[PDB]
Design an enzyme around this catalytic site. Structure first.
Site, PDB file in Angstrom:
ATOM      1  N   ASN C  89      13.620  -4.202  -3.470  1.00 15.78           N
ATOM      2  CA  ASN C  89      13.550  -4.615  -4.787  1.00 15.78           C
ATOM      3  C   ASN C  89      12.718  -5.755  -4.944  1.00 15.78           C
ATOM      4  O   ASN C  89      12.181  -6.097  -5.899  1.00 15.78           O
ATOM      5  CB  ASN C  89      14.879  -4.543  -5.602  1.00 15.78           C
ATOM      6  CG  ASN C  89      14.461  -5.068  -7.198  1.00 15.78           C
ATOM      7  OD1 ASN C  89      13.978  -4.417  -7.922  1.00 15.78           O
ATOM      8  ND2 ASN C  89      14.878  -6.077  -7.407  1.00 15.78           N
ATOM      9  N   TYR C 153      -0.857  -6.655  -7.985  1.00 18.39           N
ATOM     10  CA  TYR C 153       0.638  -6.028  -8.307  1.00 18.39           C
ATOM     11  C   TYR C 153       0.398  -4.593  -8.069  1.00 18.39           C
ATOM     12  O   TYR C 153       1.224  -4.068  -7.333  1.00 18.39           O
ATOM     13  CB  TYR C 153       1.123  -6.457  -9.523  1.00 18.39           C
ATOM     14  CG  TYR C 153       2.676  -6.342  -9.882  1.00 18.39           C
ATOM     15  CD1 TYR C 153       3.640  -7.012  -9.128  1.00 18.39           C
ATOM     16  CD2 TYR C 153       3.160  -4.980 -10.520  1.00 18.39           C
ATOM     17  CE1 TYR C 153       4.880  -6.500  -9.055  1.00 18.39           C
ATOM     18  CE2 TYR C 153       4.432  -4.848 -10.487  1.00 18.39           C
ATOM     19  CZ  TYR C 153       5.360  -5.484 -10.130  1.00 18.39           C
ATOM     20  OH  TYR C 153       6.613  -5.082 -10.100  1.00 18.39           O
ATOM     21  N   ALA C 155      -1.844  -2.940  -6.236  1.00 18.19           N
ATOM     22  CA  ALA C 155      -2.128  -2.725  -5.214  1.00 18.19           C
ATOM     23  C   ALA C 155      -0.989  -2.518  -4.354  1.00 18.19           C
ATOM     24  O   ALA C 155      -0.685  -1.905  -3.376  1.00 18.19           O
ATOM     25  CB  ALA C 155      -3.096  -3.711  -4.590  1.00 18.19           C
ATOM     26  N   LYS C 157       2.346  -2.172  -5.230  1.00 17.30           N
ATOM     27  CA  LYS C 157       3.307  -1.128  -5.333  1.00 17.30           C
ATOM     28  C   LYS C 157       2.751   0.216  -5.109  1.00 17.30           C
ATOM     29  O   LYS C 157       3.596   1.114  -4.547  1.00 17.30           O
ATOM     30  CB  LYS C 157       3.865  -1.308  -6.923  1.00 17.30           C
ATOM     31  CG  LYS C 157       4.543  -2.874  -7.159  1.00 17.30           C
ATOM     32  CD  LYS C 157       5.717  -2.899  -6.439  1.00 17.30           C
ATOM     33  CE  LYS C 157       6.979  -3.707  -7.242  1.00 17.30           C
ATOM     34  NZ  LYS C 157       7.949  -3.765  -6.170  1.00 17.30           N
TER      35      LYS C 157
END
Lengths: 245, 245, 245, 245
Positions: C89, C153, C155, C157
């Protein structure tokens, strides 16, 4: 004929393979083409295009370094004027199973495939958004949705898809389209070492029943680069004869 | 110029709207065009194409009836020779919330949009697989992944996508490609009654910041129909300026 | 009750927000939980779980460094035994428009969100493939298919999704499942810090009509971690009340 | 234990196969189950559940007829109270290549699989939207994105996905979730009846290396039906061990 007349295009990774076929098709449609590559065969690639009557130039560049990408764009524009089309084709593989992948092999693939594409997209965006027009076409891979031995490669190419879609959202209102192509199994000068047994398995996964050519990818690039494709934005188009990896 | 010279195309639902813009672009690229529609304005549509210098004919057809689809193809081929390109654009809406949708409104939309597309695909497939060449382009909808009030319409257009993909798997080895296009928000002669407030909401969802034209859809159809797109098969291409419904 | 009884789980980024809600649900179902985070509030997070009767420990870790990830896993296993479940996470944002994103802000987000997730997946895979059992659950983002201001971000995820799918292909035959969850708009301190107009826009995009809770993400993690989900592998599941970003 | 205690479920097509495994898991979690099927073996199915300690009843129903679906829901509610959970599993195959599929075989598969699922969803929606709570879980198929010989079946199951997503958009704000599951290759009497070469090919396509069980599908249904899955809506979840068809 001449869908891209006097447009300027940069194609990264275009000395050989898929990228050179993209360059050929763009040149056929009238674009002036910058072959950007680390491979010195890029000069012979540009010369081949010139011999056919096209305007082309090789610029040696490592796209993982921002200063080199900045220089690439400045030199491209000094030679051929504003860059209308960027094709991010450059990519490398350093395959390994997840439990064995070295940090160096991770780093190298992300640096070229993902960071290098970002850096080039960024230089195109700065320019294209001010000018009110442009085309960015990213070459991803059928591996973006997984493939054994390709933790790094799949990360990199899925990451390119995410950036493609983000860039569409930021740049569409400025008259720019940003799209991705996922080639399937394409037979090129860079796949001459694939063993026969492996080719048979690959061909069995392709409904069309044959491996594509670099120019098949190039035709799709040339359409997306054209004025006719002004309303296609943020798309991921497979050029694979139906193949599901 | 003339990417589709010598080819013959049937476009269903082409009397007006998106279908007529598809027909215009195919004609521009040199195709002989059959406008297949129930709308009698189809004759005026075909006449407009002829006035512009193209070869075009209107054939009145209800595509939900197999005998009429059989007759359409036989008449088309008697007039213009083998049908190289089928564009399944015909579709209707009878919207209603899920809890209110009548059985008649369900049945009508599935019969035209889903069954009609199947029947036309089937007549094309029988011929194209024997001849070793062909193009089938299905016009689906942004609604295929859901839209309020469109239980029947979304069912029908998602179903078209499933058939597109099946047909690619069956027909690719015979030299046929089968692909779908999902238009976004397109401003045409059939959307002149959308209220201003509703257009504003729609436009707010489009990164490009404007509604597309029927010819935008047509450009993508014409590329897919071309020999250059031989290796694109089973794809679903959005023509929507980045819009996510 | 007790679907994960005496399983050991590492949850990265679990001091606050979505990750802490994940930790809560895993502990409710009987897992012993390692909270792995850079945030020192991780200790208070672990203490909260312990106060409820669960076994939990905080381990301070920067997952971008391979040595720290190796130490995390060794310490986790010394405390609680073999790691059955890894939940990746941890992630950071350094948002900026594509034309403005600094190289440092690119580098940092890729290093934590993408490389860090790889390094943790790798430590899990080495162990789980030898033991013949395991669960890896990656938390991606609704942004993986694009979001304004999130080149880096998105990219990172999307890259996590590609790795998820690759890992499924490599590890499924060893009894391990690898899946991803994309939270929608979840009510946390971070989403409550957006401007009022952005909050209202986001709620208007959620069919459910409310922002979800961290525990909603946790419920899906706990199901995927369970024996019941042994045949779910390579999936990307949205937990978002129908929201399309 | 007892995630669905006090709830009542209808499972269509639950006499055998995947639907019966769904019914078993819902009953294990405490639901009262109506087996709705045309197959008279439905009585033996309901008796088996009762013998295990569950509350279950067989109701003979052809879901293609609206009056029968209305009667199903009225009888179900007279026996067991308000229907909290609808699982649409009923489906038939009449496979044939596109060029050979008879009109009757097209019609019958769409009428059961697509129209029948709509009619059931509609009866659930009318009730659940007034009550402010509910679960609708549609069983689609790996074939929704194409499979040779399945023009009709793929149409029908993709159409189910479209309706799922539409229904989510209409019903989420009323406290109802609507989701779909796509089983992979599941070991049932029907899949054990395929030719040997096809069985082997299918196992080679599954990363997990084995065909799943009906109860694996049931576990995912039971999670989606639970209160814990309140924020999962409009999803299409594969239960396939990583298999890509």
């Amino acid at each position: 004929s001449m869908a891209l007349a006097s447009k300027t295009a940069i194609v990264t990774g275009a000395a050989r393979g898929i990228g050179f076929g993209i360059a050929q098709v763009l040149a056929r449609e009238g674009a002036r083409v910058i072959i950007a590559d680390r491979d010195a065969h890029g000069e012979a690639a540009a010369a081949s295009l010139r011999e056919s009557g096209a305007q082309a130039l090789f610029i040696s560049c490592n796209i993982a370094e921002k200063t080199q990408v900045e220089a690439l764009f400045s030199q491209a524009e000094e030679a051929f004027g504003p860059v209308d089309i960027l094709v991010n084709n450059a990519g490398i593989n350093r395959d390994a199973m997840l439990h064995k992948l070295t940090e160096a092999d991770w780093d190298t693939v992300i640096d070229v495939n993902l960071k290098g594409t970002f850096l080039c997209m960024q230089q195109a965006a700065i320019r294209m958004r001010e000018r009110g027009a442009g085309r960015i076409i990213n070459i991803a891979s059928a591996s973006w949705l997984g493939n054994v031995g390709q933790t790094n490669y799949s990360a990199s190419k899925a990451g390119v898809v995410g950036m493609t879609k983000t860039a569409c959202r930021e740049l569409a209102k400025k008259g720019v389209t940003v799209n991705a192509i996922c080639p399937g199994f394409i037979d090129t000068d860079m796949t001459r070492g694939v063993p026969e047994n492996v080719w048979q398995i690959m061909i069995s996964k392709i409904p069309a029943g044959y491996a594509g050519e670099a120019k098949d990818v190039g035709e799709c690039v040339a359409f997306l680069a054209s004025d006719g494709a002004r309303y296609i934005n943020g798309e991921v188009i497979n050029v694979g004869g139906g193949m599901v990896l």
